[PDB]
Amino acid sequence: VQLQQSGGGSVTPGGSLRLSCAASGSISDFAAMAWYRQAPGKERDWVGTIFSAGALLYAEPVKGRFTISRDNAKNTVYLQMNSLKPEDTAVYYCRLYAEAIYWGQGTQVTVSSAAAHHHHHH
Structure with a gap:
């Protein structure tokens, strides 16, 4: 796989996140990286x-x-992404323009009061 996306998760309204899109290709071939959001x-x-x-x-x-x-x-x-709101809940995709053009597999972001609920983890 060319692109590895992470840094998503579930956060309460008002919070921030920092998504990452790491490419396995060469740094010299990098020409541009675009981001997209796809709500449900x-x-x-x-x-x-x-x-x-x-x-x-x-x-x-x-x-x-x-x-x-x-x-x-x-x-x-x-x-x-700062001052997140429930409306920002979406799958966020990166797209790399380098030697070839590649889509990432997306990262889900959920903005909800239920992000304060952690019992499934602990």
Whole structure:
């Protein structure tokens, strides 16, 4: 597999998360990494993109709530998401444009008061 996504989970309204998309390919082939959000039965909706030389492209609705960054040298891009609301519950996908174009397998984010319920774990 080319892309490994993680950093998702369940968080209460108001919280933040930082999704990660790690590519197994070479850092020199990186051209851009875009992020998309797909709410339950909704269409995949583009959120933003980071380019190799570091420019940051954000969709009109984002208005500063989400931050795209790249690890120094772990060939990984991050999407930090703040002030989460139940409406942000979705599967978040990264897409890499390098030597070839690849989709990630998605990361589920759930924003709910039930994120404060941990008895299944402990």
